[PDB]
Paper text:
Trimeric capsomers of the VACV D13 protein form a transitory, stabilizing lattice on the surface of the initial spherical immature virus particle. The crystal structure of D13 reveals that this major scaffolding protein comprises a double β barrel “jelly-roll” subunit arranged as pseudo-hexagonal trimers. The D13 lattice seems to act as a mechanical scaffold for the growing crescent membrane of the IV with sufficient rigidity to maintain a constant radius of curvature of the crescents even before they close to form complete spheres (Chlanda et al., 2009; Heuser, 2005), thereby fixing the size of the immature virion.
Author numbering:
A (entry chain C), C (entry chain A): 15 to 547
B (entry chain B): 15 to 548
Write the structure that this text describes.
C-alpha cells in the first residue's frame, strides 16, 4: 500500500536534564583610559552554571535637578553603550561596537521600549529654580543580543569549566543628553555615574555533551571625513556586508533650533521646528518690531495679505488684531548664500500661508492653519552652518529669546544627513572583492532585500552570503583567494549632488562598512575561537 | 570528498490521510445555581471526528435601548468568560479561568479584535429617549486558545471513541458593561441572556496511530485582600510560575469620574479625565458661581491671570469674556487629607495653565491649551476613595451635573492599581520551593525576560523552567522532593510605600500566583489526564 | 539508564556548496494586448543561476507636472500589476492574478510599505500653474511572493538547463491614479510609460541533487454582475477555497466627492467627506446665498439655532458673524428617492450639531465641533448614483466649486461595497462538492478562522483543507470522485437586503471564488508542472 508519516502523534523525546535560572550581577566599575571612560566588568564563574545566554544590562538613571532644558535621547540605554566584549582565559569569544548592537536590535520594539523610550525620559523637561526636579530617577534595560540567543539552549554559550568575563565600555554622558545653554551640564557630567547590573539566563545542566559551534563576529570600518570609499582588509569568510553613512558634526557646536522629544515621527520633527520659527516669523506689534538684528528684514503685511519674497508669495491673515497694532512678516529669518546677488536659501520663502487669531487676554497669536514646504533636512541643519564663514549674509536673524532655546544634540547613532535617515544620499554603490566587482546598484535594492528578508522597517544596504539555517548548519560564506589578491572588500559610493547655497551641503559625511566574519567556537580545554581561513 | 546535507531539495513525506472541517454547535444554557450563573454546555459526539482543536466561541450581543450612558468594556468576549472546562467520560482533560485564558491571548491582536474592540461597542453611547437605540446588535468571537493549537494536527485533541464536553461559565453582565446611574441596568440585567455557539476545527482521519502526549494545565491562587503572600500546594512538575496583583474595589461603589472608551492609550485616559474636570474647574459667571458645595473654594481670577493655591500658581486666561461676567477658578475640585494639619492632595494644584475663548453663541468656554501634571493614577481613583471616612475634607467639590455623569466600571481583568497597569507596585519578590529561596528580585527582571522571550509588551513577573521545544520533546520542569518538603511554591512580595494623603493608598490589592502543572495525556480507555508525580 | 536527546549541542551539518547573488534585469516592453495593455518580459538563463527565489519588481514613477489634483492609490506598485506568470520551455510553472498576489502580501506591512504607501505618494497634491510639480519622481518595489520563498533554499525554483521567462501584465495607469477634472489625464495617459526592472536572489550551486516538489497554484473565477453563484470546474486536489465580493462601478463615471489620501482609517474617510460637505452645508451670507441650484433648499437659522428637516433637528451656532450677515443651512445638500412624496435619503439630516467661528480676515467659517451620523458607506457612494435617472430629485445640490473638486477613483482591488470593506453583505454561504453540500454558514466563521490561522486582520471566508507543514510534506487536499461527479466546487451566497431608497443599493456586486490546486514540479527534461489527478 503506502508508508505514511504520522502528522497526528509524536514520540515525545526526553531532553537533557537541566534547570534554568535568572542571574543578576553587580560589576567592577573603572574610569581608566581616554577622558577617563567608564568600563564595567562582570565575572561569571560557578561550578553549577554550565551554559548561558540572553544578556540584559540594567542602568540606574539619577534624579536630574536645577535650571534649564534637559531630556534623554530615545533608547537612552543602547546609546550609552560604546563597546561590549565577551571573553575567557583564552581571550575574546565575541565583541560588538555599541552602534552595531543597536542596529541588530532596531527591529525589536520590546528591547527598544525597555532601553528607555517614554514621555518621562525623552521629552525635553524644564527646571525653573536651582532646586527644581527636571527628571525623576529611573531604570532602563538593555538587551545585549548575542549569537547565543538564536536557538535558545542549542545555541547557548557553554562554560567548559571556564571563567567568562563580560566587559561594557560606556559613552560619555554628553552623548545621551539633549540640553540647552541654561542647563549646568558641567556639574551634571562631574556628578553623573553609570550604575550597571548584568543579568543572564543560566543553565545548570547534568551531563552536557559539548560539540563545536560557529559564530559571526561583526567588524566595522569608518572612512575618512567626506571620502566616498572604505575598505575591509583580511576578509577570508564573511556571512554578510552592510553599508551606511553617518554625519560628522565636528565642524559645529552641535546646536539645533528644535527637537520633538518622545514624538519621533518625521511629521513630529517638522511640526516642532515650524512651531519654533512661528514665534519670530509673524509679529503683531504697534510700530516696527524691536529686538531683531539690523540685518533682519521685517515687512508690514499689506491689505491683500500677500508679502512677496522675490518669487515666493506668503499669505498672512491674523484675526482680532488691535487697531493700534499691525501684522509683520520676517522675510529672512534664516538665510544662506555663498555669493552676493545670487541664489539664496531663505526659510521664510518655505511658507505659503499663515493664518490665526490674536489673543487680547494672553497678548499672543494662536496659529490655526499653516501651509509650508519645510522638510526633515531643515530641522537637521546645525545652527553653526547657518552662521558659517562661507555665508555672505548674517544668516541667523532670529531673536535672542529664540537663540537661547537652541538644543545640544550629540546622539551617537545618527545615520545619513537628517535625524530620521529619510534622505538617501547614495546615488550608486559598488562592492569589490579584490579588483573584481562583486556587486553594484543605482537604487537601494540591497536595503529592500534586507528589510524583506529580516522583516524590519529600518534596514541598510546589506549583501547576504548566507541563506542556510543557523546553528544546525555550518554557515555559507564569501571565501577569499589570497594568491589572486581577493582578501579584501572595497566599497565605493557616489553621493547625490547638493546645492552649494543650501547649509546641508556642509554637513560632513562618513561611510560605514560592517563585515560579519565567521569564527569556530571550540570548547576544547576552555572556550576558544578561531577565525575561519 | 565532503558529505553534504542537501539544502536545495527535500523528500516530501506523505502525511496521514485526513480531511479537516469547521464545525459549529448550539449548546444547552443553564442558570443553575450560585447567583444563578450562566453555564453553556457543548457535547461533541461523532464517530467520524477523530481529533479537534482551535475552539472559537461566538456571542450574540443584543440591541441596547433606553435612556442613559452605556458602553461595553474593551475585548467584551473574553471579559464575560469566567471559566472553560473540557471533559471526557474519564473527567476533566483541560480547564482554565477566564482571566488566565485572556492573559494567554493578550498578545494576539487578531483574537482581541474579534472579541469586541471597536468604536461601535466600546465608546460610551447615550440614549436620549426611552425608545432610543444605545447599541445595535452585534456578534463577537472568542478564540479559546488550548494546548491543542500549538503544533496544529500534531497537538490536536484525539476523541478516539470518547465524547468530549466543553463547558463555559459566564461572568455577570455587570462586569462587561460601563454605565451611568441614568441607565436602567436593573431591567437590562433581568432581560439580558448569553447566546453562545461553539466552533472548532475537526479532523476526519483514516487509520490514526495515537501516541501519548503532555499538557500544561494553568492553576491559579489568589491571596487574601492586602496579604503580600500566596502559596501553591502540591507542585511536583511545573513548567512556569507567574505573579501579578489585582485591585479590589469592594470598599467602593465602583464609580469613576471618566472613561476614554475605544481610545485606550494612557494619553486617552488622561485627556478624558481632564475634559471632565475642566467643566467645573474654570467658570465664566456673572457673580460668584452657584450650585457647588459650601466646602468648594471658587476664586475670581486676578488681572495678571495667576491664582495661587499655596505653592502652586495656576495661569487662567479666557478670551471674549462678556463685560457683565468674570472668570473663576475652582481651587479644591478634588481634595484628600488624613489630618487638618497635613499634606493635601488637591487636583486643582495639578494645573499650571488654562487658556481658551468664551462663546457668545453657545454660552460656553472652548479650551485651547492646558498645561497639567495629571497622570494615569488620578484617572483610576474610585470616587468613593475621594469621599472616604479617612478623608477629613468633603473631598468631591464638583457640581451635581458632573457627579451625575460618573461611570460604573466592573471590568474583571484589571491588574495593578491603574487601568493601564502602568505603575509597578511590587518593590521586591521572593519565590520559595519548600523553605529554600528559589528566586528573588528587587526589580522586574523576570517581567523584562517574560516580555523579551515571548516578544510581548504586556508581560508579568514570570519564572520559566522550560526552554525545550514544545510537543516534540517532554517539557522541562521544576521537580519536587517530597521527603525534603520541596513540594510547594510560596510567593512573598513587598509593596511599594505610597503617601498616606494620596487617595490611591486606599486601593485594596490581591496577589495572584499562576502555576502551570505538567500532565500526561493517555488515550487507552478514552481520553484521560494524569498529574506527573514521583 | 534513560536515552536523552541533546538540547545543548548540535553537530553543525555541512550544506550544499552555493553562492547567493542579487540579480537585476531590464525587460522587454510591449503594448500588444486588447486595449494595447503593457507587458514586461524577463528572460533568465545562466551557468551560475542554478536556483532562484524572492522576486522583487521595481517601478520608476515619473514626475507629474501641471494643474489639477492628483495622487496615487495606496500600495500603487501592487495595484498596477494585472497578472504575473513564470514559464519554461514546457509551458507555465506558476502564475497569479494581480489581486490574488496583493491578497497574499496584504499581511506583510514591509512589502506593502515598499510598494508605495507614503504621504508623498498617496496624498492628493495640487498643481497651481502649468509648470508646477504635482508629484516628484519615485521608485516603488513590489515583492512578487511565490511558493519558492516559503523555506528559502529548500523551496527555491531550480532552473535546470531551462530558460525561465517572467511575464508581467500591467493595469491601465487610470487604475492607480486619483484625479479631478482639472488634471490633464488625457495627455498624462498618452505620455505615461511603465519602467520596470526585475530583481531576484540567484543561487550558484555546486553539484545540485534535484528532487521533485509540490506547488499550489491559485485560480480564480468571477461571477456575473450581481449573480450570487459561481463555480470552479475540474477540482481534483485543492488545498483551499476562498470567497469574497467586489463592487462594479461600470454604471458610474467613477467620481467620488472625497478621498482621505495617505490617512486610511475609517475615521479618516468620514472626516475627509464631512470636511467637503461643510463648505456648502453652513453658509454666512448677507442675503440668501447665491450660486446653488434652484432645487437647493437653503434656510436661515432661527434665534434658537435649531433647523428642522422633517424628524431631524440640526443645531447650528456660529460665533463672530457680522451684523450685516446671517447664518444659513443647506437642508438638502445631497438627496435621493425613487418616488415623489415618499422616503428620502438626505445627507443634511445626518447632522445634529454644527459649531464654529466666522473669520473676518479670511471671510470663512472655521468649524469647531460637529455631531453627525455619517458612515463609511456615505463616503463610498459614487456621485453618479446621487444624480441617476432612478432619482426623482435633482440629487446633487452642491455648488459648482464643490462639484469641481470631485475625484476619479478606479482602484482595482476594492472589496465589498465600501472603501474599507467594513460592511458585510453576505448573509449566508453554501459550498457544494458535486451536488453534496460540503459547507454552509450564516456568519463569517470561515473568515474568523482565516484571520486567526494566518494572523491577518484582512481575511476572507476561506475553507482550508491543508494543515500539514509545507515543503517537508506532500500537502493535504480535498480529493475528487469523478465517477460520482464530485470534481467541481459550486459557491452560492445570499446577499443581505438593502434599502431601495439608499443610493448604495445601486452599487453592483461581483462574487469572487479563489481555488488553490495542487501541482507536482518535476525537473526531468527541464522544469515542468503536472496537475494532481
Amino acid at each position: 500500500s503506502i508508508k505514511r508519516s504520522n502528522v497526528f502523534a509524536v514520540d515525545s523525546q526526553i531532553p537533557t536534564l537541566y534547570m534554568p535560572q535568572y542571574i543578576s550581577l553587580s560589576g567592577v566599575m573603572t574610569n581608566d583610559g581616554p577622558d577617563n571612560q567608564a568600563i564595567a566588568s562582570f565575572e561569571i564563574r560557578d561550578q553549577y552554571i554550565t551554559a548561558l545566554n540572553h544578556l540584559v544590562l540594567s542602568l540606574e538613571l539619577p534624579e536630574v535637578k536645577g535650571m534649564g532644558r534637559f531630556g534623554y535621547v530615545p533608547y537612552v540605554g543602547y546609546k550609552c553603550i560604546n563597546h561590549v566584549s565577551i571573553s575567557s582565559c583564552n581571550g575574546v569569544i565575541w565583541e560588538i561596537e555599541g552602534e552595531e548592537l543597536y542596529n541588530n536590535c532596531i527591529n525589536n520594539t520590546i528591547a527598544l521600549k525597555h532601553s528607555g523610550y517614554s514621555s518621562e525620559l525623552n521629552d525635553i523637561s524644564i527646571g525653573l529654580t536651582p532646586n527644581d526636579t527636571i527628571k525623576e530617577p529611573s531604570t532602563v534595560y538593555v538587551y545585549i543580543k548575542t549569537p547565543f540567543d538564536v536557538e535558545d539552549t542549542f545555541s547557548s554559550l557553554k562554560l567548559s569549566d571556564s571563567k567568562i568575563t563580560v566587559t561594557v565600555t560606556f559613552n560619555p554622558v554628553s552623548d545621551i543628553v539633549i540640553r540647552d545653554s541654561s542647563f549646568d551640564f558641567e556639574t551634571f557630567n562631574k556628578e553623573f555615574v553609570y550604575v550597571p547590573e548584568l543579568s543572564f539566563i543560566g543553565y545548570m545542566v547534568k551531563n552536557v555533551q559539548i560539540k563545536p559551534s560557529f559564530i559571526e563576529k561583526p567588524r566595522r570600518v569608518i572612512g575618512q571625513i567626506n571620502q566616498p570609499t572604505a575598505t575591509v582588509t583580511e576578509v577570508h569568510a564573511a556571512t554578510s556586508l552592510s553599508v551606511y553613512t553617518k554625519p560628522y558634526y565636528g565642524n559645529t557646536d552641535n546646536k539645533f533650533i528644535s527637537y520633538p522629544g518622545y514624538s519621533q515621527d518625521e511629521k513630529d520633527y517638522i511640526d516642532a521646528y515650524v512651531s519654533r520659527l512661528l514665534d519670530d516669523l509673524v509679529i503683531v506689534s504697534d510700530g516696527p518690531p524691536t529686538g531683531y538684528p539690523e540685518s533682519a528684514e521685517i515687512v508690514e503685511v499689506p491689505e491683500d495679505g500677500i508679502v512677496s519674497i522675490q518669487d515666493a508669495d506668503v499669505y498672512v491673515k491674523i484675526d482680532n488684531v488691535p487697531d493700534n497694532m499691525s501684522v509683520y512678516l520676517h522675510t529672512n529669518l534664516l538665510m544662506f548664500g555663498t555669493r552676493k546677488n545670487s541664489f539664496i536659501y531663505n526659510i521664510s520663502k518655505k511658507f505659503s500661508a499663515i493664518t490665526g487669531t490674536y489673543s487680547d487676554a494672553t497678548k499672543r497669536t494662536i496659529f490655526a492653519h499653516i501651509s509650508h514646504s519645510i522638510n526633515i533636512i531643515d530641522t537637521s541643519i546645525p545652527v553653526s552652518l547657518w552662521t558659517s564663514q562661507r555665508n555672505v549674509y548674517n544668516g541667523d536673524n532670529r531673536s535672542a529669546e529664540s537663540k537661547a532655546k537652541d538644543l545640544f544634540i550629540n546622539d551617537p547613532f545618527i545615520k545619513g544627513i537628517d535625524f530620521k535617515n529619510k534622505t538617501d544620499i547614495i546615488s550608486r554603490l559598488e562592492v569589490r572583492f579584490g579588483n573584481d566587482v562583486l556587486y553594484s546598484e543605482n537604487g537601494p535594492i540591497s536595503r529592500i532585500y534586507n528589510e524583506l528578508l529580516t522583516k524590519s522597517n529600518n534596514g541598510t544596504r546589506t549583501l547576504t552570503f548566507n541563506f542556510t539555517p543557523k546553528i544546525f548548519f555550518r554557515p555559507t560564506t564569501i571565501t577569499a583567494n589570497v594568491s589572486r589578491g581577493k582578501d579584501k572588500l572595497s566599497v565605493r559610493v557616489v553621493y547625490s549632488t547638493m546645492d552649494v547655497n543650501h547649509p546641508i551641503y556642509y554637513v560632513q559625511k562618513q561611510l560605514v562598512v560592517v563585515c560579519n566574519d565567521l569564527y569556530k567556537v571550540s570548547y576544547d580545554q576552555g572556550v576558544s575561537i578561531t577565525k575561519i581561513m
